[PDB]
Coordinates of N, CA, C and O and ligand atoms in Angstrom, one line a residue:
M1 N 111.7 140.2 88.2 CA 110.5 140.8 87.6 C 109.4 139.8 87.2 O 108.3 140.0 87.5
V2 N 109.9 138.7 86.7 CA 109.0 137.6 86.4 C 108.9 136.7 87.6 O 109.9 136.4 88.2
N3 N 107.7 136.4 88.0 CA 107.5 135.4 89.1 C 108.2 134.1 88.8 O 108.2 133.6 87.7
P4 N 108.9 133.6 89.8 CA 109.6 132.4 89.5 C 108.7 131.1 89.4 O 107.5 131.2 89.9
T5 N 109.2 130.1 88.8 CA 108.5 128.9 88.7 C 109.3 127.7 89.4 O 110.5 127.7 89.2
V6 N 108.7 126.9 90.1 CA 109.4 125.7 90.7 C 108.6 124.4 90.3 O 107.5 124.5 90.0
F7 N 109.3 123.3 90.4 CA 108.8 122.1 90.1 C 109.0 121.0 91.1 O 110.0 121.1 91.8
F8 N 108.1 120.1 91.3 CA 108.2 118.9 92.1 C 108.0 117.7 91.2 O 107.0 117.6 90.6
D9 N 108.9 116.7 91.3 CA 108.7 115.5 90.6 C 108.2 114.5 91.7 O 108.9 114.3 92.6
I10 N 107.0 114.0 91.5 CA 106.4 113.2 92.5 C 106.5 111.7 92.3 O 106.4 111.3 91.1
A11 N 106.7 111.0 93.3 CA 106.7 109.5 93.3 C 105.8 108.9 94.2 O 105.4 109.5 95.3
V12 N 105.3 107.7 93.9 CA 104.3 106.9 94.8 C 105.0 105.6 95.1 O 105.3 104.8 94.2
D13 N 105.3 105.4 96.4 CA 106.1 104.3 96.8 C 107.3 104.1 95.9 O 107.7 103.0 95.5
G14 N 108.0 105.2 95.7 CA 109.2 105.2 94.8 C 109.0 105.2 93.3 O 110.0 105.3 92.6
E15 N 107.8 105.0 92.9 CA 107.6 104.9 91.4 C 107.1 106.3 90.9 O 106.1 106.9 91.4
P16 N 107.9 106.8 89.9 CA 107.5 108.1 89.3 C 106.1 108.3 88.9 O 105.5 107.4 88.4
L17 N 105.5 109.5 89.2 CA 104.1 109.7 88.9 C 104.0 110.8 87.8 O 103.4 110.6 86.8
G18 N 104.6 111.9 88.1 CA 104.7 113.0 87.2 C 105.2 114.3 87.9 O 105.6 114.2 89.0
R19 N 105.1 115.4 87.2 CA 105.6 116.7 87.7 C 104.5 117.7 87.9 O 103.6 117.8 87.2
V20 N 104.6 118.4 89.0 CA 103.7 119.5 89.3 C 104.6 120.8 89.3 O 105.7 120.8 89.8
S21 N 104.2 121.8 88.6 CA 104.9 123.1 88.6 C 104.1 124.2 89.3 O 102.9 124.1 89.3
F22 N 104.7 125.2 89.9 CA 104.1 126.2 90.5 C 104.6 127.6 90.2 O 105.7 127.7 90.1
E23 N 103.7 128.5 90.0 CA 104.1 129.9 89.9 C 104.1 130.4 91.3 O 103.2 130.3 92.1
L24 N 105.2 131.1 91.7 CA 105.3 131.7 93.1 C 105.0 133.2 93.0 O 105.7 133.9 92.2
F25 N 104.1 133.7 93.8 CA 103.7 135.1 93.7 C 104.7 136.1 94.4 O 104.4 136.7 95.3
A26 N 105.9 136.2 93.9 CA 107.0 137.0 94.5 C 106.6 138.5 94.4 O 107.0 139.3 95.2
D27 N 105.8 138.8 93.4 CA 105.3 140.2 93.2 C 104.4 140.6 94.4 O 104.4 141.8 94.7
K28 N 103.7 139.7 95.0 CA 102.9 140.0 96.1 C 103.3 139.5 97.5 O 103.0 140.2 98.4
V29 N 104.0 138.5 97.6 CA 104.5 138.0 98.9 C 106.0 137.5 98.6 O 106.2 136.4 98.6
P30 N 106.9 138.4 98.5 CA 108.3 138.1 98.1 C 109.0 137.3 99.2 O 109.7 136.3 98.8
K31 N 108.8 137.5 100.4 CA 109.6 136.8 101.5 C 109.1 135.4 101.6 O 109.9 134.4 101.7
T32 N 107.8 135.2 101.5 CA 107.3 133.8 101.5 C 107.6 133.0 100.2 O 107.9 131.8 100.3
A33 N 107.5 133.7 99.1 CA 107.8 133.1 97.9 C 109.2 132.7 97.8 O 109.6 131.5 97.3
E34 N 110.1 133.5 98.4 CA 111.5 133.2 98.4 C 111.9 132.0 99.2 O 112.8 131.2 98.9
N35 N 111.2 131.9 100.3 CA 111.4 130.7 101.2 C 111.1 129.4 100.5 O 111.9 128.5 100.5
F36 N 110.0 129.3 99.8 CA 109.6 128.2 99.1 C 110.5 127.9 97.9 O 110.9 126.8 97.7
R37 N 110.9 129.0 97.2 CA 111.8 128.8 96.1 C 113.1 128.2 96.6 O 113.6 127.3 96.0
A38 N 113.7 128.7 97.6 CA 115.0 128.2 98.1 C 114.9 126.8 98.7 O 115.8 126.1 98.5
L39 N 113.8 126.5 99.3 CA 113.6 125.1 99.8 C 113.5 124.1 98.7 O 113.9 123.0 98.8
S40 N 112.9 124.6 97.6 CA 112.7 123.8 96.4 C 114.1 123.5 95.7 O 114.3 122.5 95.1
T41 N 115.0 124.5 95.7 CA 116.3 124.4 95.0 C 117.3 123.7 95.9 O 118.3 123.1 95.4
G42 N 117.1 123.8 97.2 CA 118.0 123.3 98.3 C 119.3 124.1 98.4 O 120.2 123.7 99.1
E43 N 119.3 125.3 97.8 CA 120.5 126.1 97.8 C 121.0 126.5 99.2 O 122.1 127.0 99.3
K44 N 120.2 126.5 100.3 CA 120.7 126.8 101.6 C 121.2 125.6 102.3 O 121.6 125.7 103.5
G45 N 121.2 124.4 101.7 CA 121.7 123.1 102.3 C 120.6 122.3 102.9 O 120.9 121.3 103.6
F46 N 119.3 122.6 102.8 CA 118.2 121.9 103.3 C 117.0 122.3 102.4 O 117.1 123.3 101.7
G47 N 116.0 121.4 102.4 CA 114.9 121.6 101.6 C 113.9 120.5 101.4 O 114.0 119.5 102.1
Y48 N 113.1 120.6 100.4 CA 112.1 119.6 100.1 C 112.4 118.3 99.5 O 111.7 117.4 99.5
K49 N 113.5 118.2 98.8 CA 113.9 117.0 98.1 C 113.9 115.8 99.0 O 114.6 115.8 100.0
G50 N 113.2 114.8 98.6 CA 113.1 113.6 99.4 C 112.0 113.6 100.5 O 111.7 112.5 101.1
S51 N 111.3 114.7 100.7 CA 110.3 114.7 101.7 C 109.0 114.2 101.2 O 108.8 113.9 100.0
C52 N 108.0 114.0 102.1 CA 106.7 113.5 101.7 C 105.5 114.4 101.9 O 105.6 115.4 102.6
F53 N 104.4 114.0 101.4 CA 103.1 114.7 101.6 C 102.5 113.8 102.7 O 102.0 112.7 102.4
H54 N 102.7 114.2 103.9 CA 102.2 113.4 105.0 C 100.7 113.4 105.4 O 100.3 112.5 106.1
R55 N 100.0 114.3 104.8 CA 98.6 114.4 105.1 C 97.9 114.8 103.8 O 98.1 115.8 103.4
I56 N 97.0 113.9 103.3 CA 96.3 114.1 102.1 C 94.8 113.8 102.4 O 94.5 112.7 102.7
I57 N 94.0 114.8 102.2 CA 92.6 114.7 102.4 C 91.8 115.0 101.1 O 91.8 116.1 100.8
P58 N 91.2 113.9 100.5 CA 90.5 114.2 99.3 C 89.5 115.3 99.5 O 88.8 115.2 100.4
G59 N 89.4 116.2 98.5 CA 88.4 117.2 98.6 C 88.8 118.3 99.6 O 87.9 119.1 99.9
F60 N 90.0 118.4 100.0 CA 90.5 119.4 100.9 C 91.9 119.9 100.5 O 92.0 120.9 99.9
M61 N 92.9 119.1 100.7 CA 94.2 119.6 100.4 C 95.3 118.5 100.6 O 95.0 117.5 101.1
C62 N 96.4 118.7 100.0 CA 97.6 117.8 100.2 C 98.6 118.6 101.0 O 99.0 119.7 100.5
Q63 N 99.1 118.2 102.1 CA 100.1 118.9 102.9 C 101.4 118.2 103.0 O 101.5 117.0 103.1
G64 N 102.5 119.0 102.8 CA 103.8 118.5 102.9 C 104.8 119.5 103.5 O 104.4 120.5 104.2
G65 N 106.1 119.3 103.2 CA 107.2 120.1 103.6 C 107.8 119.9 104.9 O 108.6 120.8 105.3
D66 N 107.5 118.9 105.7 CA 108.0 118.6 107.0 C 109.2 117.8 106.8 O 109.1 116.5 106.9
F67 N 110.4 118.4 106.6 CA 111.6 117.6 106.3 C 112.4 117.4 107.6 O 113.4 116.8 107.5
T68 N 111.9 117.8 108.7 CA 112.7 117.5 110.0 C 112.0 116.5 110.9 O 112.7 115.8 111.6
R69 N 110.7 116.4 110.8 CA 110.0 115.4 111.6 C 109.1 114.5 110.8 O 108.7 113.5 111.3
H70 N 109.0 114.8 109.6 CA 108.3 113.9 108.6 C 106.8 113.6 109.0 O 106.3 112.6 108.5
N71 N 106.2 114.4 109.8 CA 104.9 114.1 110.2 C 103.9 115.2 110.4 O 102.8 115.0 110.8
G72 N 104.3 116.5 110.2 CA 103.5 117.6 110.4 C 103.8 118.4 111.6 O 103.2 119.4 111.9
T73 N 104.8 117.9 112.4 CA 105.2 118.6 113.5 C 106.5 119.4 113.4 O 107.0 120.1 114.4
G74 N 107.2 119.4 112.2 CA 108.5 120.0 112.1 C 108.5 121.0 110.9 O 107.6 121.6 110.5
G75 N 109.8 121.0 110.4 CA 110.1 122.0 109.4 C 110.7 123.3 109.9 O 110.7 123.6 111.1
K76 N 111.5 123.9 109.0 CA 112.1 125.2 109.3 C 112.2 126.0 108.0 O 112.2 125.5 106.9
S77 N 112.2 127.3 108.2 CA 112.4 128.2 107.0 C 113.8 128.6 106.8 O 114.7 128.3 107.6
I78 N 114.0 129.3 105.7 CA 115.4 129.8 105.4 C 115.8 131.0 106.3 O 116.9 131.4 106.2
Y79 N 114.9 131.5 107.1 CA 115.0 132.7 107.9 C 115.2 132.3 109.3 O 115.3 133.2 110.2
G80 N 115.2 131.0 109.6 CA 115.2 130.5 111.0 C 114.0 129.5 111.2 O 113.3 129.2 110.2
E81 N 113.7 129.1 112.4 CA 112.6 128.2 112.7 C 111.3 128.6 112.2 O 110.6 127.8 111.6
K82 N 110.9 129.8 112.5 CA 109.6 130.4 112.1 C 109.8 131.8 111.5 O 110.9 132.4 111.7
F83 N 108.8 132.2 110.8 CA 108.8 133.5 110.2 C 107.3 134.0 110.2 O 106.4 133.3 110.2
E84 N 107.2 135.3 110.1 CA 105.9 136.0 110.2 C 105.0 135.9 109.0 O 105.4 135.6 107.9
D85 N 103.7 136.0 109.3 CA 102.7 136.1 108.2 C 103.0 137.3 107.5 O 102.9 138.4 108.0
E86 N 103.4 137.2 106.2 CA 103.8 138.3 105.4 C 102.7 139.3 105.1 O 102.9 140.5 105.3
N87 N 101.6 138.8 104.6 CA 100.4 139.5 104.3 C 99.3 138.5 103.9 O 99.7 137.3 103.8
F88 N 98.1 138.9 103.8 CA 97.0 138.1 103.4 C 96.3 138.7 102.2 O 95.1 138.6 102.2
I89 N 97.1 139.2 101.3 CA 96.5 139.7 100.1 C 95.8 138.7 99.2 O 94.7 138.9 98.7
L90 N 96.4 137.6 99.1 CA 95.7 136.5 98.2 C 94.9 135.5 99.0 O 95.1 135.3 100.2
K91 N 93.8 135.1 98.4 CA 92.8 134.3 99.0 C 92.8 132.8 98.5 O 93.4 132.5 97.5
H92 N 92.1 132.0 99.3 CA 92.1 130.5 99.0 C 90.9 130.3 98.0 O 89.8 130.0 98.5
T93 N 91.1 130.6 96.7 CA 90.0 130.6 95.8 C 89.5 129.4 95.2 O 88.5 129.3 94.6
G94 N 90.3 128.3 95.3 CA 89.9 127.0 94.7 C 91.1 126.1 94.6 O 92.2 126.4 95.1
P95 N 90.9 124.9 93.9 CA 91.9 124.0 93.7 C 93.2 124.6 93.1 O 93.1 125.5 92.2
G96 N 94.4 124.1 93.5 CA 95.6 124.6 92.9 C 96.3 125.7 93.7 O 97.5 125.8 93.6
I97 N 95.6 126.3 94.7 CA 96.2 127.3 95.5 C 97.3 126.7 96.4 O 97.2 125.7 97.0
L98 N 98.4 127.3 96.5 CA 99.6 127.0 97.4 C 99.6 127.9 98.5 O 99.8 129.1 98.4
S99 N 99.6 127.4 99.8 CA 99.5 128.2 100.9 C 100.3 127.6 102.1 O 100.7 126.5 102.1
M100 N 100.7 128.4 103.0 CA 101.6 128.1 104.1 C 100.8 127.4 105.2 O 99.8 128.0 105.7
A101 N 101.3 126.3 105.8 CA 100.7 125.7 106.9 C 101.3 126.4 108.1 O 102.3 127.1 108.0
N102 N 100.6 126.4 109.3 CA 101.1 127.1 110.5 C 100.5 126.5 111.7 O 99.6 125.7 111.6
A103 N 101.0 126.9 112.9 CA 100.6 126.5 114.2 C 100.1 127.7 115.0 O 100.3 127.6 116.2
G104 N 99.6 128.7 114.4 CA 99.2 129.9 115.1 C 99.8 131.1 114.4 O 100.4 131.0 113.3
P105 N 99.5 132.3 114.9 CA 100.0 133.5 114.2 C 101.5 133.5 114.1 O 102.2 133.2 115.1
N106 N 102.0 133.9 112.9 CA 103.5 134.1 112.8 C 104.4 133.0 113.1 O 105.4 133.1 113.8
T107 N 103.9 131.8 112.6 CA 104.7 130.5 112.8 C 104.9 129.8 111.5 O 104.9 128.6 111.4
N108 N 105.1 130.5 110.4 CA 105.4 129.8 109.1 C 106.8 129.2 109.2 O 107.7 129.8 109.7
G109 N 107.0 128.0 108.5 CA 108.3 127.3 108.6 C 108.5 126.9 107.2 O 108.8 127.7 106.3
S110 N 108.4 125.6 106.9 CA 108.5 125.0 105.6 C 107.3 124.2 105.2 O 107.1 124.1 103.9
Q111 N 106.4 123.9 106.1 CA 105.2 123.2 105.7 C 104.2 124.0 104.9 O 104.1 125.2 105.1
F112 N 103.6 123.3 103.9 CA 102.8 124.0 102.9 C 101.6 123.1 102.5 O 101.7 121.9 102.8
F113 N 100.6 123.6 101.9 CA 99.6 122.7 101.4 C 99.1 123.2 100.1 O 99.2 124.4 99.8
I114 N 98.6 122.3 99.3 CA 98.0 122.6 98.0 C 96.5 122.3 98.2 O 96.1 121.1 98.4
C115 N 95.8 123.3 97.9 CA 94.3 123.2 98.0 C 93.8 122.3 96.8 O 94.2 122.4 95.7
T116 N 92.9 121.4 97.2 CA 92.1 120.6 96.2 C 90.6 121.0 96.1 O 89.9 120.5 95.3
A117 N 90.3 122.0 96.9 CA 89.0 122.6 96.9 C 89.1 124.1 97.4 O 90.2 124.4 97.8
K118 N 88.1 124.8 97.2 CA 88.0 126.2 97.8 C 88.1 126.1 99.4 O 87.3 125.4 99.9
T119 N 89.0 126.8 100.0 CA 89.1 126.7 101.5 C 89.1 128.1 102.0 O 90.0 128.6 102.7
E120 N 88.0 128.8 101.8 CA 87.9 130.2 102.1 C 88.0 130.5 103.6 O 88.3 131.6 104.0
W121 N 87.6 129.6 104.5 CA 87.7 129.8 106.0 C 89.2 130.0 106.4 O 89.4 130.4 107.6
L122 N 90.1 129.7 105.5 CA 91.5 129.9 105.8 C 92.0 131.3 105.5 O 93.2 131.7 105.7
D123 N 91.2 132.1 104.7 CA 91.6 133.5 104.4 C 91.9 134.3 105.6 O 91.2 134.3 106.6
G124 N 93.0 134.9 105.5 CA 93.5 135.8 106.6 C 94.1 135.1 107.7 O 94.5 135.7 108.7
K125 N 94.3 133.8 107.6 CA 94.9 132.9 108.6 C 96.1 132.2 108.1 O 97.1 131.9 108.8
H126 N 96.1 131.8 106.8 CA 97.2 131.2 106.2 C 97.6 132.0 105.0 O 96.8 132.5 104.3
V127 N 98.9 132.2 104.8 CA 99.5 133.0 103.7 C 99.5 132.2 102.4 O 100.3 131.2 102.2
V128 N 98.7 132.7 101.4 CA 98.7 132.1 100.1 C 99.9 132.8 99.3 O 100.0 134.0 99.3
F129 N 100.7 132.0 98.6 CA 101.9 132.5 97.9 C 102.1 131.9 96.6 O 103.1 132.3 95.9
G130 N 101.3 131.1 96.1 CA 101.5 130.5 94.7 C 100.3 129.7 94.2 O 99.2 129.7 94.9
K131 N 100.5 129.2 93.1 CA 99.4 128.3 92.5 C 100.1 127.3 91.6 O 101.2 127.5 91.1
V132 N 99.4 126.2 91.5 CA 99.8 125.1 90.5 C 99.7 125.7 89.1 O 98.6 126.3 88.8
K133 N 100.7 125.6 88.3 CA 100.7 126.1 86.9 C 100.5 124.9 86.0 O 99.7 125.0 85.0
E134 N 101.3 123.8 86.1 CA 101.1 122.6 85.3 C 101.0 121.4 86.3 O 101.6 121.5 87.4
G135 N 100.3 120.4 85.8 CA 100.2 119.1 86.6 C 99.2 119.0 87.6 O 99.3 118.3 88.6
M136 N 98.1 119.8 87.5 CA 97.0 119.6 88.4 C 96.4 118.2 88.3 O 96.0 117.6 89.3
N137 N 96.6 117.6 87.1 CA 96.3 116.2 87.0 C 97.1 115.2 87.9 O 96.6 114.2 88.4
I138 N 98.3 115.6 88.1 CA 99.2 114.8 89.0 C 98.8 115.1 90.4 O 98.7 114.2 91.2
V139 N 98.4 116.3 90.8 CA 97.9 116.6 92.2 C 96.6 115.7 92.4 O 96.4 115.2 93.5
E140 N 95.8 115.6 91.4 CA 94.6 114.9 91.5 C 94.8 113.4 91.7 O 94.2 112.7 92.4
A141 N 95.9 112.9 91.1 CA 96.3 111.5 91.2 C 96.8 111.3 92.6 O 96.6 110.3 93.2
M142 N 97.6 112.3 93.1 CA 98.1 112.2 94.5 C 97.0 112.0 95.5 O 97.0 111.3 96.4
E143 N 96.0 112.9 95.3 CA 94.9 113.0 96.1 C 94.2 111.7 96.4 O 93.7 111.4 97.4
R144 N 94.1 110.9 95.3 CA 93.5 109.6 95.4 C 94.2 108.6 96.4 O 93.7 107.6 96.7
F145 N 95.4 108.9 96.8 CA 96.1 108.1 97.8 C 95.9 108.6 99.2 O 96.4 108.1 100.2
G146 N 95.1 109.6 99.4 CA 94.7 110.1 100.8 C 93.5 109.4 101.3 O 93.0 108.4 100.7
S147 N 93.0 109.9 102.4 CA 91.9 109.4 103.2 C 91.3 110.5 104.0 O 91.9 111.6 104.2
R148 N 90.2 110.2 104.6 CA 89.4 111.1 105.4 C 90.2 111.6 106.6 O 90.0 112.8 106.9
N149 N 91.0 110.8 107.1 CA 91.8 111.3 108.2 C 93.2 111.7 107.9 O 94.0 112.2 108.7
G150 N 93.5 111.8 106.6 CA 94.7 112.3 106.1 C 95.9 111.3 105.8 O 96.8 111.6 105.1
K151 N 95.8 110.1 106.4 CA 96.8 109.1 106.3 C 96.8 108.6 104.8 O 95.7 108.4 104.2
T152 N 98.0 108.5 104.2 CA 98.0 108.0 102.9 C 98.2 106.5 102.7 O 98.9 105.9 103.6
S153 N 97.7 106.0 101.7 CA 97.8 104.5 101.5 C 99.1 104.0 100.8 O 99.3 102.8 100.9
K154 N 99.8 104.9 100.2 CA 101.1 104.8 99.7 C 101.9 106.0 100.1 O 101.3 107.1 100.3
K155 N 103.2 105.9 100.1 CA 104.0 107.1 100.4 C 104.2 107.9 99.2 O 104.6 107.5 98.2
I156 N 103.8 109.2 99.4 CA 103.9 110.2 98.3 C 105.1 111.1 98.5 O 105.1 111.8 99.5
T157 N 106.1 111.1 97.7 CA 107.4 111.8 97.9 C 107.7 112.8 96.8 O 107.2 112.6 95.7
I158 N 108.4 113.8 97.2 CA 109.0 114.7 96.2 C 110.4 114.1 95.9 O 111.4 114.2 96.6
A159 N 110.4 113.4 94.8 CA 111.6 112.7 94.4 C 112.7 113.6 94.0 O 113.9 113.4 94.2
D160 N 112.3 114.7 93.3 CA 113.2 115.8 92.9 C 112.3 117.1 92.9 O 111.1 117.0 92.8
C161 N 113.1 118.1 93.0 CA 112.5 119.5 92.9 C 113.5 120.5 92.5 O 114.7 120.3 92.7
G162 N 113.0 121.6 92.0 CA 114.0 122.7 91.6 C 113.2 123.8 91.0 O 112.0 123.9 91.1
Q163 N 114.1 124.7 90.4 CA 113.5 125.9 89.7 C 113.5 125.7 88.2 O 114.5 125.2 87.6
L164 N 112.4 126.1 87.6 CA 112.4 126.1 86.1 C 112.7 127.5 85.5 O 112.8 128.4 86.3
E165 N 113.1 127.5 84.3 CA 113.2 128.7 83.4 C 114.6 128.9 83.0 O 115.0 128.8 81.8
Ligands
L99_201 N1 100.5 122.8 113.8 N2 101.3 121.7 114.2 C1 102.6 121.8 114.2 O1 103.4 121.2 114.9 C2 103.2 122.7 113.2 C3 102.6 123.0 112.0 C4 103.1 123.9 111.1 C5 104.4 124.5 111.3 N3 104.9 125.3 110.4 C6 105.1 124.2 112.5 N4 106.3 124.7 112.7 C7 104.5 123.3 113.4

């Protein structure tokens, strides 16, 4: 009944930075929210723990969740390799939005991005499923290690992750 909350403890070249928490909109996109929740807890035997944010573009977004190829070409969901676009009820309204990365229609896996700006051109193309609840300061700090082309100057990792409450 209560939307679940998940957390990521972020490190920069192995050094703790801080924690980002997210509210997952299970009330509006339950199947997508559940995939991210389970990847965050690792309860299916695979997930986000130890993965990195491989592409960070200041003023745009930080992208991660590729735990099979570590570069933006991999990932898999709890439902199989890919899963469908659940719905496009929620929009990319500004910094803090959590949304699914994809490679075309109906190709969601495990990759996700956190908006650091409004990305309205993505509406109806990428499934929005959550928002940052605490630690937008930590996202902003992360963002400073990106670049115009997305390559990061230090390695930004999810050192730990899980479910709160
Ligand atoms: N778009 N480039 C990719 O290789 C890719 C990007 C996102 C994904 N979820 C998957 N599976 C692949």
